[PDB]
Assembly symmetry: D2
Homo-oligomer: 472 residues x 4
C-alpha cells in the first residue's frame, strides 16, 4: 500500500530522517560556535531560507516570463519578473540600459553561459590568473600547462597577472598581452584580489584590442550594490555575479548585460543597439541549463530586496572596515598581506615568509573552530599546499561583529599561526610528521575553547538559536 | 546609518520581510493543490525534503570531495554528502565495489554536461534520441533545419537516432546502422517524452559493435528504476545520469553514477583491466565545470533517497505506472492518438495533429482551467512554439494519492479541455490572435475550471499544510 | 673557389648526376616496355614536359596576376592568366559564370583549399566512402573509426556509400543521411567508381539540406573536357580536379567556382551573387600554400590547349571504348567487375570470388611488367590486402592502343590472375608462402616476355624511344 | 581520329604551344636582363631542370619506398631512397639519429604536415612574428587579429617578436611568453630575419615549457648544408626546409626528424626512443598529400648531390660575403638595415626613416629590372604598403657575382631609392599621385638601361644563353 500523503509528505524532517536532521543541527551549531572566515561564505537570512525551502521547488518553468515551455507559470512568472527588476534596482541600473538573467544555477554556470553567449568554441579569453587572484572560471590552467577549468578547454585562455612585487594588477602587461593575444573577451573581477579594479583602464584595453569586457563581481557584489566599491557597470558590457557571497543571498548566479543604444565608436554605424539579451538568454536556456530553480529565484528576490536597504549599506561599510581592521592587526604582528592591505571584504595572507603552507594553517585553524581556506598566492603551483590563507569579513560581520571584534579575530589567528609554527618546529615540515602535533595538543584544545566562548555569544541569522537542538 | 540588528533582517520570517514574495509563494501553493498538475517532469516533494532544502546547509563552501576539500569547516557537510552517496547506491541496488556516484551536479543538464566532459574531448561524437522522437535537449539536440540548440550539439558532434515513424518505437536497426557509419564515442539512451521502456541489452550490443561508451539518462523514470518497476540501465550502461526531482520525488539536483572495479571480459581488452570513470567524472564536475556544491540540495537529496528506498515508495511507483496506463486507455477509447498506442512508464505523449490542433493551444486553454500540461514535440515537428503534441504525466497527481479511477476522471477533464479547444478554433479561427478571442468569458472554460478545482480539493497535498495556507 | 656557372649550372644531367640519370633512363624504359594500367596515371606530352622543366621554376609569384607580393612577374602573370582562361575554355565555361584558381600544387591540396575556403574547422562534409570508390580527401576514416585523411580530422565527415548489391551510389541513403547529418558541403566524384554521376540528384539533395555541392572530377576531367561524361558544372557550386590523370597534363590541381548571380531559390534575397572567388583564392594563398609552382602552371596551360583539340576528344572517346572492351573481355572470362561494367576510364575488379586479394595480383603483375594497383572494394577493411584491383585505360590509350589491343591486355590480365591462382593453390594463402612461388617461375618469365613484346609495338609520348639509353 | 603519338606527344613545345613557348623565352630573357634580388629566389641548374622536366612526372607512388599503394615503383623507389640518403648526407646527419621525408610538395605543405604529425587541432604553437621576420606558416595572424595563415586557424598561435632596440629575437620575452602560453611546439627559423639563431637557447626555452622544437631553415638551408651558419640539428626535434631558396634546388619541401635513443632527461624512462618517423610520414601521406611528385624528388636528389660539393660550400661563403658587402654599401649611404647588418644571405632594409613604403620602391625597381620584394619590418600592419624592402644575395651570386659586383648592385639600389624619393617629392605620397612619376620618366629609362647593360654580361645557369630566343 502507498503511505498516506501525511506520513511521507507532511511529516517533519526530524521524524522522517533523524540522521540528516541531526547532521543539520550539528552544522547549525558549528556555524554558531566558530569564527567563520571563508571570504566567499556568508550567513543568509531566515526570510531567504523560507523562500529557498518552499513549494517553488516543484515547478518546471523553462523559457522566460510570458514565454514558457510549460503551463502553470502565472505566479512563477511574477516571481522571476520581480527578481529581475529588484536585481536592476539593487545595482542602480536603468532598465532601458541593462537587463538581467536570474536563472543561472550558481556562479560557474553563470560565467560559462555568459561566455557561451558571446563566444564560439576555442575563442580567446583573458582573465586574472588564479595565483594572482582570479577564479577557476576565468580560464584557469596551471603554470605546468594542465587545463583545469573547462573555461580553458572549450575556450582558449591567456591569463593576466599581478605585478610580482606589488601584488597589484599589472595594467601595462595586461595591455601588452591583450594586443599580442587578441582576445575576444577580457574578464575582470576576482576571488582573492584584495584591491579595487580600474574598470576604466580595462575598458581602454578592451577597446584597443576590440574585445568585449566582462566583470565577474561575485565576491564584492554586496559592496557594489551598496556603492562601496567601484561600479563595473560604468564600463563593462556584461557583469556576472553569484548571490551567496557578500550579497548575502541564496546560492545562485546572475548575468547582467547592456541593452539599448551603443555609445559612439569610430567604425560602428549610427543608431546601433546592443545585441546581448537574446544571446545571453539563449545560452542559459535552452543551450546549457534546463528548468530554472524557482525556489532559488524566489529566495534571490528576497535577498535583492534586503540588499537595497539602508541597513545593508551599513553592513557593506562595516564589512570593509572590519577587513581593514583585521589586516592592520595582522600586519602589526609582522605578517605579510598581499598588497599590504585591502580595499574590499578580504585579506590574502602570504605565509611563505613564515615557512608555512596554507593547508597546515587551515587544518590547525579548523581544529580550533576557526574556518578559513588555504589559498594560492603569486607564484604558487601547489593547490594541495599553497603559500597563503584567505580571510574574509562578510560572515562574521553578518553576526554583528565590529572592528574591535575583528581585532580579536586577528589575535585568534595570530595564536593559531603561532601554534602552527610551534607544531612544525617540534614535529617537522613533512605533513605526516606535522600531523603528529595535532593529536592531544593542549594548546589546540585551549584555543578551541577560547574560540567557542568568543563565537557562541554573537547573534546568528537564519534560524533561532533558542530552538536549536545543540545549545552547548 | 546603523546596521540592522540580526533579529530584524536575519531572523524575521519571510511573511514580514517580503510580503510580496510571501504572497506569491502562497498563491503558488494554492495553484499546486487546487488544479490537476500533469507535467510529466514535475512532482510534489515532501515537507522533509523541503526542510533540508531551506536550511543552514546553504551557507557552506565545500569544494572537493568528502575528506579532501578546498575549505575548512566540513566535518558535518562531509557526513551529509557521504550519506547522500551511500543512500544513492542503495536506492538503485548497486554494489559499492562496482558503482560510484557523484551527487554534486546542480541539476540534470549540469549532470549530463559533466558526464560528457569527463569522457569526451571537444567535438567528440555522440548519439542520443532525437528530441521530436522523445530525447532530451542535452542528448545532442539540433533541429531538422540544422540549427544547433543544445550546447551538447555545439561542444560535441551529435547525430541523433530516431523512432520508427509509423510505430513510434525506437528503430534499433537504424540506430545500429547509424552508429556503425558515424562511429560515436558515446551513445546516450533514456528520454524525456518516450512512453516505452528501453532495450538496454540491445544498446549495449550496438555500443560494443562500434566501440562506444553507453550512458543512460534515467531522469524521468529514476523513481521507477529505484522501485524496480522498469528495466534497470545499470545492468548494461557504463554511466547513468539522472535528475532527482521528477519521478524520484526529491529536490532539484542531478547525480552521475559510474562503473568501478574490473571490466567484464572483452576480446582485445587486456586482462585485469579496470574501469577509470571515477576520477574523470569527479574532476569534470569539479573543478572543471561547477564551483561550490549546493549542500542544502545534497542534504535534501539524502532525505529523498531514504524515502525512495521505502516500501511505500515502491507502491507509489507501481501506482504511477498503473495510473498512466489507465489514463492512456481512457484517452484512446475516445479516439485520441497516443504515441506507440499506450505507455510502459509514467507518461503518455498525445499527438494532436489528427485534430488539426497544436499543443500550445491545448496548453493555454488547459491552464485557464487549472489543468497544467506542457505542449510537446512529436515526430516530425519543427515548431517548438506550436508543436503537434501535448505530454501528460502521472507522478505529481499520484503523489496526492490519486488512483486509476481518479486518472480516468483526469482523462475526462482532458477530453473536455481538448474538445473545448477544438470548438474555439472552429468558431474563432486557427490564427492564435483569433483563437485567443474565444478564451474571454467562456462559460464552458469556467465550468471546467470549477469542476477541476472541486475534484482537486478532494485530495491531500505533500510538502506543506493546506490547513495553514494563506489562500484557502 | 666557386665552380664556373657552366660547370655546375649548364652541364647536362647525364654528366652532373649519372646515378639519377641512369634511374630516369631505366624508368623511361619501364614506362614504354610494360602495360601501364594504373587508372590515375597517364603519359603526358613532351611539350608539357618542356614547360615543366624550365626557368619558370625560379620565380616567386605569390598573389594573383596583377596583385603580387614580389616584383618581376610581367611574364609569369601572362602565363597564369593564359592558364586560367584556357582552363575555362577547356571545360566550356563562361567567364562571367565561372572562375578558376590554377595554383594548387596537386589534387589533395586543391581539395583541402576548397574546403578551407567554404568551411570552418569541424564543419560537416559528406563524400563517397573510400571502399565505395571515393578519395582519401573526401573525408576518409575507416569502418574501425580510425581517422585517416586530414579531411576527417579538421572537418567532420559522414561518408555515403554505394548499394552493397548493385555497386551504384545509394541515392536514397545519401538523402536520408544528409537530412539527418546536415552537412555544410556534399562532395561527389570519385577514385574508383566505374559509373557516371547523377549530379542533378546530388543538387536536389544538397538543396534539401542547405549544403554546398562540390564535384572532384580528378579522374574523369579529360572525359569531362571532351564532353564524354556528365558535366558537373551544370549542378555543382565548386569543381576541383587534378590535371595529371585523364586530362593528360602535369601534376597539379585546379579549383573552379561559380561567379555572378545565383539562380532563383526560395528564401534567398533578390540580386544575390556567388561569393566564392575571394574565399577560394585566399584559402590557396595566403592561407595554405606559398609560392605557386610556375613551371607546373605553364605546363598546365600547354596541357589545357592540348585538351581542347579535336584529337583530344577522339582520345577521350577511345579511352571509354577501351575500358568497355577490356571489361567485356574480363567478364567473358567469368571475372566480377563492380557494377558489371563501366561508363568511364576504369574498371574495378572484385577478386574476392576467386579467393584472392589485390596485393597478390598487383605483385605478380608487377613481375610481368603489368602495372596495376590493388584497390579497396565494398566492405574491405584491409588496405594492405584489399579485395580488388583497379584497371584504367588512359595511359595505354595515350600510346595509341585501341579495343583489340585492350582485349589482348585483358588476356594478359587473365593469364596473370590464372598464374596467381596457380601459385596460391600450390603454396597457400600466407604471403610469405605465396612469395616463394614467385622465384624461378617459368610462366611468369613467359608472360613478362609476351608483355614486353606487345608493349614495344606502340609509340610513346613524352620522350623519344629512339634516343633513350636502354633499348 | 586520334592524333598520332608523335604529333601531340613528341612534338616540341615551340611547335605545340608557341604562345607559352614565347612567354617562357621572354621570362628567360627577363631573368638574364635584370638584377634579381628576391631573397627566396635562386637560379637552379640545368641538371636539376632536366630531372624536373622528365617522365618521372607520370608515376603514382603513394607510400614509402618498398611499401607502396601501386605497382611499378622499382626505379621510383631507388630515386626516393637516394634523395633521402643524400638529404641526410648534405646536412651531415647520422642516419641512425635522423630521418627525412622528401615528399612535401613545397615549404608550406612541409610545415603543415610537420605540425599535423605532432599536434592535434587547436594545439598551441609559437613562431617568429611575421613583421619580426617569421613566415606565414609560423602562425601568422595580424596585429588587428585577422587570421591569415591556416596555421593560425587550425592551430592556436602566439608569435614571439624581436626586440625593438636591436632587431634581434628577444629571448627573455620569448621565454616569458612560452611559460605563460605553454605551447606544444616552438618554431624557429624565418623568412626575413638577417641574423643567426641561438638554437641552444631555444632548446632551453622548449625544455622549460615542455615544448617540441622545430626549425624551419628554408631560407638558409644552403648555408646550413655548407656549415656556414649554426646547425639547427644540434638542438631541434624536427627541421623543415624548402629546397629552392639558398639550397638551389627544385621547388619542394623536406621534413627531417630525430630517430633512435633520446638524450638523457629526468622525468623520462630509460631506453626511450624518438617516435616522430611514423607520425611524420603519416601526416604527409595519407593524411594530407596524395601522390608524390617524383620529378621534384628526382630533381631534388640532383640538387642535394650538388649541394654536397666543395664548389657549393664556396658558393655559400660567397653568398654571405656578397650580402655583407651589399649591406655595408647601403649603410655607407646612410640607409637603415634591420639589426644593422646581416649574418646570412639577406638584408632587410627599413625605408621608414626615408618616408617611403616598400611597395613604391618595389614598383620603381621593377620598372628598372631590379627585382625585389616589399617586406614587413617591425611594427608594420600594412601588407600593401609595408615599411621595408628585402634584398637577397643567392640568385645573383649564382650568376658569378662577387663583392665588387654587389657594391654596384648597392649603387643601383641607391639610384632607385633616390629616384623614388624624387618622384614622391614632386608628385606626392598618395599612390595614385606617385604613379604619375613612373610614366615617361627619363631617369627610370636610363636606370633600366644601365641595369640591363650590367646584368646581361653575367653567365646564367639553367639554360644556354646561346640558344635562347631573345638575345636582345
Ligand atoms: N584566486 C583564487 N582563490 C580560490 C579559488 C579561485 O578560483 N581563485 N577557488 C574557487 O573555488 C578556491 C580554490 N579552488 C581551486 C580548485 C582547484 C585547484 C587546482 O589547481 N586543482 C588541481 C590540483 C589538485 C592537487 O594538486 O591536489 C586539480 O584539481 O587537479 C586550485 C584551486 C578557493 N580559493
Ligand atoms: N617576414 C616575412 N616576409 C615575407 C613573407 C613571410 O611569410 N614572412 N612572405 C612569404 O611568402 C612574403 C610576404 N607574404 C605575405 C602574404 C600575405 C600577407 C598579408 O598580411 N595579407 C593580408 C593583407 C592583404 C592586403 O592588405 O592587401 C591578406 O591577404 O588579406 C603579408 C605577407 C614575402 N616576405
Ligand atoms: C569571482 C568568482 N566567480 C564565480 C565563482 C563561482 O561561484 P560558484 O562556486 O557558485 O560556482 C566564484 C566562487 N569562488 C568561491 C571562493 O572564492 O571561495 C568566484 O570567486
Ligand atoms: C531525460 C532528461 N534529462 C535531463 C533533464 C534535465 O534536467 P534539468 O531540467 O534539471 O536540467 C531532463 C529535463 N526534462 C524536463 C522535461 O522533460 O520537462 C530530462 O527530461
Ligand atoms: C621560412 C620559410 N618557410 C617556408 C616557406 C614556404 O615555402 P613555399 O613558398 O614553397 O610554400 C617560406 C617561403 N618564403 C618565401 C619568401 O620568403 O619570399 C619561408 O620563407
Ligand atoms: C578523385 C581524386 N581526387 C583527388 C586526388 C588527389 O590527387 P593527388 O594525388 O595529386 O593529391 C585523387 C588521387 N587519386 C589517385 C588514385 O586514384 O590512384 C583522386 O582520385
Amino acid at each position: 500500500h502507498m503511505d498516506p500523503v501525511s506520513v511521507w509528505g507532511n511529516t517533519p524532517l526530524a521524524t522522517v530522517d533523524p540522521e540528516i536532521h541531526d547532521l543539520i543541527e550539528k552544522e547549525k551549531r558549528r556555524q554558531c560556535r566558530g569564527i567563520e572566515l571563508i571570504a566567499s561564505e556568508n550567513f543568509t537570512s531566515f526570510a531567504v531560507i523560507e523562500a529557498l525551502g518552499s513549494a517553488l521547488t516543484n515547478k518546471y518553468s523553462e523559457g522566460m516570463p510570458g514565454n514558457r515551455y510549460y503551463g502553470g507559470n502565472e505566479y512563477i512568472d511574477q516571481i522571476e519578473n520581480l527578481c529581475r527588476s529588484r536585481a536592476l534596482q539593487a545595482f542602480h541600473l536603468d532598465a532601458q540600459s541593462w537587463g538581467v538573467n536570474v536563472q543561472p544555477y550558481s556562479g560557474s554556470p553563470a560565467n560559462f553561459a555568459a561566455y557561451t553567449a558571446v563566444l564560439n568554441p576555442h575563442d580567446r579569453i583573458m582573465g586574472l590568473d588564479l595565483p594572482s587572484g582570479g577564479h577557476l572560471t576565468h580560464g584557469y590552467y596551471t603554470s605546468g600547462g594542465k587545463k583545469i577549468s573547462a573555461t580553458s578547454i572549450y575556450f582558449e585562455s591567456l591569463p593576466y597577472k599581478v605585478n610580482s612585487t606589488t601584488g597589484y594588477i599589472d595594467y601595462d602587461r595586461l595591455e601588452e598581452k591583450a594586443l599580442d593575444f587578441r582576445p575576444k573577451l577580457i574578464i575582470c573581477g576576482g576571488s582573492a584580489y584584495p584591491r579595487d579594479w580600474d574598470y576604466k583602464r580595462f575598458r581602454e584595453v578592451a577597446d584597443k584590442c576590440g574585445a568585449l569586457l566582462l566583470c565577474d563581481m561575485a565576491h564584492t557584489s554586496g559592496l557594489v550594490a551598496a556603492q562601496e566599491v567601484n561600479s563595473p557597470f560604468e564600463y563593462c558590457d556584461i557583469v556576472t555575479t553569484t548571490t551567496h557571497k557578500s550579497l548575502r543571498g541564496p546560492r545562485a548566479g546572475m548575468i547582467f548585460y547592456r541593452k539599448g543604444p551603443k555609445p559612439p565608436k569610430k567604425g560602428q554605424p549610427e543608431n546601433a543597439v546592443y545585441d546581448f539579451e537574446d544571446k545571453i538568454n539563449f545560452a542559459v536556456f535552452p543551450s546549457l541549463q534546463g528548468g530554472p530553480h524557482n525556489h532559488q529565484i524566489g529566495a534571490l528576490a528576497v535577498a535583492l530586496k534586503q540588499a537595497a536597504s539602508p541597513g545593508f549599506k551599513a553592513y557593506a561599510k562595516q564589512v570593509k572596515a572590519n577587513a581593514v581592521a583585521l589586516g592592520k592587526y595582522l600586519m602589526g604582528k609582522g605578517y605579510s598581506l598581499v598588497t599590504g592591505g585591502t580595499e574590499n571584504h578580504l585579506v590574502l595572507w602570504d605565509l611563505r615568509p613564515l615557512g608555512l603552507t596554507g593547508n597546515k594553517v587551515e587544518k590547525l585553524c579548523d581544529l580550533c573552530n576557526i574556518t578559513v581556506n588555504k589559498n594560492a598566492v603569486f607564484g604558487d603551483s601547489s593547490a594541495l599546499a599553497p603559500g597563503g590563507v584567505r580571510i574574509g569579513a562578510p560572515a562574521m560581520t553578518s553576526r554583528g561583529l565590529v572592528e574591535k571584534d575583528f581585532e580579536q579575530i586577528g589575535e585568534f589567528l595570530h595564536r593559531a599561526v603561532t601554534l602552527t609554527l610551534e607544531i612544525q618546529k617540534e614535529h617537522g615540515k613533512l605533513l605526516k610528521d606535522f600531523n603528529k602535533g595535532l593529536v592531544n595538543n593542549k594548546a589546540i584544545e585551549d584555543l578551541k575553547a577560547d574560540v567557542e566562548k568568543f563565537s557562541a555569544l554573537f547573534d546568528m541569522p537564519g534560524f533561532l538559536v533558542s530552538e536549536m537542538k545543540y545549545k552547548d
